[PDB]
Symmetry: D2
């Protein structure tokens, strides 16, 4: 058990402490080799073959970089080797809870399969970390390297999911508050997890990363702000932070919310739903779970990866025929067809509980156009996407503190108007995409007229292509011209 050096295409030669190596070399961690970072995105961007495993190594790496840099510049913070290891472990382990095709699983499949349960990848990561520790005898190894497992396990979990229940954390005291801002920053979202995915996703997607995390690290300091020690940025770096969030939004627009990538995730989800009654996953004590219930038993969940897609695709069981056929149609590129995109106007914000009513609404629209085919609710898919700066309607830069060159330990606030008038006025929006499951030319024509009529009825924005797809519907709305 000495340190290992690993060559990563993003970060280069990265050192892994032997405790980290012990954690990595387990079935619970290695599982992440079989879960694509971007899920259905690979079916649009063929470079995006990268998995959650290598992203996890990068996050643990960068978590160590930031905590080491803070400690080197400010010995007065009393950051210990124990603290550094705990932060690196949380960075390494904060992706353990992801399921097949990453956000497809927690974002689309579980909400539909198990609408009563409240599952997040964060909670999954806590449960899987616990399973990893207990199944692999990691506690005596933590101890060997100076950790105190009771307190430090708690600290690691809290970094992943937040307070496990006035300073709300139990794993560390307030004087180490800043340590909770490294791995998953619940105050403003500025964390090393974003820095790794920006660089790594860009490298694989073939889109170029404009955020410089190493610069950020160089300019980062810990300061007291309203009685608490926070990571603060240099004042003049504020434009770079606005640009960090702009980068995140552009990656979502270009890649993660690609309209075809989304429909592929939707089809895969549909296949998994049709397969869920028939695939069995053996868990603890030989008990049997489903795709949708493996989340209840970490032994079963350990065996739940992107393999499920191929188990379905390669199946011969007649009960899996309908699931298998959806996947086959993905392979033939016989996809549900994209009809268009619109946005709500104003403060209007469509809620998750209304999502199911939307396809009916589209099908109930009455376009004043000559139509052969008539479409029903079940022929439409309506995908609602929330785009924001990570704090719903809030500006995350209002939740950052800065320091000046003349007083580096003295935290200040910077308002948006002190920065630029070219910045966003709003920090959250919704995109609404409509697709049609009938793919012939007459059905697509019809779907376009229902869609643009529905936009007009709901006072949503004019589709970008609306004059071309629905020339007889767009003139009715004077707000559109």
């Amino acid at each position: 058990d000495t340190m290992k050096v690993i060559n990563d295409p993003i970060h280069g030669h990265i050192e892994l402490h032997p405790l980290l190596v012990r954690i990595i070399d387990t079935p619970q961690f290695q599982r992440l080799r079989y879960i694509k970072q971007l899920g259905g995105g690979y079916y649009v961007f063929p470079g995006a073959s990268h998995n959650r495993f290598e992203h996890s190594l990068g996050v643990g790496y960068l978590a160590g970089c930031l905590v080491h840099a803070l400690g080197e510049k400010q010995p007065e913070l009393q950051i210990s080797e124990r603290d550094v290891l705990c932060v690196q472990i949380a960075g390494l382990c904060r992706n353990l809870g992801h399921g097949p095709f990453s956000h497809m699983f927690d974002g689309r499949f579980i909400p539909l399969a198990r609408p009563e349960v409240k599952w997040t990848h964060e909670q999954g990561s806590v449960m899987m970390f616990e399973h990893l520790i207990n199944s692999n005898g990691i506690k005596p190894v933590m101890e060997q390297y100076g950790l105190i497992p009771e307190e430090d396990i708690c600290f690691i979990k809290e970094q992943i999911v937040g307070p496990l229940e006035l300073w709300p954390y139990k794993g560390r005291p307030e004087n180490k508050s800043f340590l909770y801002e490294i791995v998953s920053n619940k105050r403003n979202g500025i964390d090393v997890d974003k820095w790794d995915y920006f660089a790594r996703d860009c490298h694989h997607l073939g889109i170029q990363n404009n955020f410089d995390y190493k610069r950020f690290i160089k300019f980062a300091r810990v300061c007291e702000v309203d009685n608490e020690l926070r990571i603060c940025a240099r004042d003049k770096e504020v434009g770079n932070l606005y640009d960090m969030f702009h980068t995140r939004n552009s990656l979502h627009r270009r890649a993660y919310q690609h309209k075809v990538g989304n429909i592929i995730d939707t089809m895969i989800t549909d296949a998994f739903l049709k397969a869920d009654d028939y695939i069995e996953i053996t868990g603890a004590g030989g008990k049997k779970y489903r795709i949708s219930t493996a989340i209840d038993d970490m032994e079963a969940y350990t065996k739940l990866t992107d393999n499920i897609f191929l188990e379905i695709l390669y199946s011969t069981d007649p009960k899996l025929k309908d699931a298998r056929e959806i996947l086959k149609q993905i392979e033939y590129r016989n996809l549900f067809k994209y009809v268009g995109e619109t946005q709500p106007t104003g403060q209007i914000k469509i809620k998750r509980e209304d999502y199911e009513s939307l396809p009916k609404e589209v099908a109930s629209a009455k376009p004043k156009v000559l139509l052969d085919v008539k479409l029903k609710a079940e022929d439409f898919i309506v995908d609602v996407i929330n785009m924001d700066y990570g704090m719903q309607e809030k500006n995350p830069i209002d939740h950052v503190s800065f320091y000046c060159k003349t007083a580096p330990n003295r935290a200040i606030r910077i308002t948006k108007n002190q920065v630029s008038q070219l910045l966003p006025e709003k920090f959250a929006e919704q995109l609404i995409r409509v697709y049609c499951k009938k793919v012939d030319r007459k059905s697509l024509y019809a779907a376009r007229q229902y869609f643009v009529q529905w936009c007009a009825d709901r006072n949503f924005t004019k589709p970008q292509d609306g004059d071309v797809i629905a020339p007889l519907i767009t003139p009715q709305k004077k707000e559109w011209n």
Copy 2:
């Protein structure tokens, strides 16, 4: 004279037609090897050693890529080899008019040295091109390769500077209107010149380029818009175009308007002004010109490059002592000191004719603080920066036309609200930076009080570090807290 291959670190292996090689291998073109692309920026970003020469090769290259792509996808446009060569030549030659330290010359020095003249690098490029053609016997070579010099020289100049002044161009007819949108796009600023400098400046600065010009080319088409053939983008590329302009603005913020780079350009300009009566540049017929009059004689201007800085720095003439001393202080990094930055609020805009009144205004401010030193007008520099999307207050994307996949010959418009609510609400602003020529601690303290008081008096934005630099001044303004 066959086709020559050149290896460029941005574009790779580029082919140059023999006519282009003939144009490049002249003193008028080769001059651009001695003019830094980013001028004083090298003194802040040590990677930014690149010159106007290699940028020009890249612009010529990309101009050819775009015109070739358009011709290949749309044979009906009747783009000829002659058209391709003329576009490549304009792309190659549109930087011929730059002077020492590029934007320092036309942006700072000429306005101060020759306030009566209206000089632009574009006009310079036309004059230098004409000089290059006539001095090197290029016309019979244009002819050899199928160009018609009268029409084609006119066409090339018009691409560079616009109409030489109802269709206002003489070099080509309206059926080739789109050709004028390649090299210098006066309609919306989307041109190949930006594409080269984004990539090349980023390469040298150590900042990563987020705009994909090759994608843009792939999706570009020519469509009829209001009776004219224009280059149009695919509808779904609109976000990428908003991002192109965001990229340009971020490069200005991080690099081109760096507060120290600007003060260095200011000092160099001051040295050139103090040198201008004494440096001689020999032009046509042995006539002598000054730095400020070389623009009147292309033979003298051919010899006016960044060398002027070293001629001053290395001089022994006592008449050049004052100019030389400024440059010496740059080498010792004894720079004028940055006092702070502010912005006017709203649509309020300081104009070029007011620039000279500003240091007097700062010096006339009456901070209610005990001050040891008192400062005069001549102790202050006030640098006003216009940041915009290239069309003053206008949104350039309102001046782009798009096409849809279902009707690729049908041009449409797309409004900002049809795209995203996270986009800029304004497309222009001004930054005001103040510096002090006296660099001792008491003078800098005093300068900061005058500055912040002036900001408060004029209702400009609170300096980002205002509470730290001027804690007794910031409390007066309740909007600042």
Copy 3:
């Protein structure tokens, strides 16, 4: 059916003709999404998650770039749109025959599972291409776009596997000879397939690519050489070609033959062998095949991918326990243990047909040392690695033709001595690595003594680390 644009991180925005899209959007092609390019290498280089699919797109792309460039510079070659499409198709389809974990399958598993059969990924690619065409109704689509399936299918297969057996090809005549040097260059190995994998593997591994393929394309021309039209390089580029091969050898040394990646491929192969009676793959007419017999039915082979590893790993059947346990030990990083390395001396080379006798040989060695444990044949792995410039002992640059700037239609040869005295004197060598499946300290000690004795018996080089 218009052109599609696809964004690749290596090549950028690549255009795909609609016929190519039709070929790509099949189960036979899409399968390649589930086969890692570098197999076991991912378990050493965590960036090496890339699959054969994206590599195939890149090869099709570069095949089109080269044939287009040649056509543009030399209209006299009469390269047609039909020729361009056929070259792009061969480039796209020359990886169809790869099996689970790529070289693990054809290099390690099939030789052990089916020692009587003579399988290559090239032959596999031809069989899978034919399966793809016939199962998906591609022929009437080729016709719609002006291809002639009889001649063109033949031409595509020949680009992949060589003559299907005087000009030995049937798909094109000798006046289009040069077209056969693009996708898989059997004359000297300079082909677009290498160019894509250098760039793509380097991108994923985190090692930087030395070779400039775009330069090569720019300087490539077709010239008559001994009555045949061949792709020739500019004379001045000869150093760059020696460097192309050096690049290939460095990628093998650093990555593809990494000693840990190799032992992982060896363990996976061992798990597949132990699983082979129990994993079932359904083929044509509902017939069932094994991992080792899926190659006998393309419908079954279509469903044979890296998934097999997870099917084994996630299995609960006691019949699969031994296979499953090997894969489990990979996850715990409990690997078969490296014992040592040696080389034959001179041009001496151990041949593929002797590979299976080698572990028995090591186990039969009689070291004159005090040895506690005794080991059997099945406890040893002996991995023979051929490092060469792609033509066994030959210098591939002796099989390249060049042209000079003063006579661009005149092909010449360039010898090694005309280039540099710093070049390799030899173009092939063999490395022999030995590992032990018993990993305790006494067994490893013993394995080392048998190994060094075997080296002495065979007159191999003295192992390092005495």
Copy 4:
């Protein structure tokens, strides 16, 4: 001062200690902004605009990286902050002695202008460092930061040039021997200076770097070898070190010895020689120096940069006409024409004293061919290039020591045959290029016949194009087949 951050395109965000900033901000250091790293190479590779300044920053950076890494892993070496600063200063300052166009100056111009003197850039760097320190009051600043100038200046100079006259060094004792292997490694050439130029030259040239220096650092240790502490590599790195030298040789072949770049350096050298009697450079006490004598006065040398090229090019003095005309012909790309390349056969180098006899020999060749025009010795340029692995005929890897991970304190040797049979058999060779100053087609034809005949007469290798350029001459030589 505090710590300054500089953004470098190769290394990213680099920290400079304030003592380093004081050294950099001097006329003697800033001078390196005006000296191209690759000289005439820019006239072939337009990306190669980079100067000695930014390379020096990178070398100082990497010198600090390596010495820091060694100290962190091996506290027993007693590397002090003082040692780290001294190593960084030597790294920073080891390019101070370069002259106009870098290797053109010490490699071509000084040998011809001052054949009696033995000038090297290393000696120049020592003299310039001394001048920098004394002219800028650096000693009291060294002292402020804990350095001891007497010992430490000596140490810095010794790192640059080697022993200034049994352990031969005075700046540090034998127990810090390894510190002399960082900046300029005279034992085997493995130093940080190569690592910076590999990366930086590749970035600018547009050729990709295949050497990973960060990996090397990770695997580097100090071990005792034959009673001395040396930097040693892990055993596994041996292949990578052979490849590092292969990389260096390939960069020389592709770029630094480009046949056209070399002829351009030759023409510039010729221009400088013709200018040398007439250009004046003012040195200490107003004394005047020439281009060839500025090396004798550091105050004059401080003002001797690439500017000399433009001073000549822009001159009007009739005495400079002949120099100026050569430079003008470079601008028109009227270059001496490349005739061909050959190599000597067998073992003994052609020596420098025979170089002058070579053009005569070529002109005296008697090709048995009909030739109308006849050429003289002075129409030929013969450029002899020594290509090697940095230790003449020796294999530098025979001078590296390695360690195995289970015995990291035991240094061993690894022989070529223990690595691969595919490695070079020889480590040094000569390339001979011939050019003709007469550029018409009949003269070039003739030059080619003389050249190939001369190759045959001297038993040199067959030119690659020999059968095409000289079809009547190549049949005579049975060794050519």
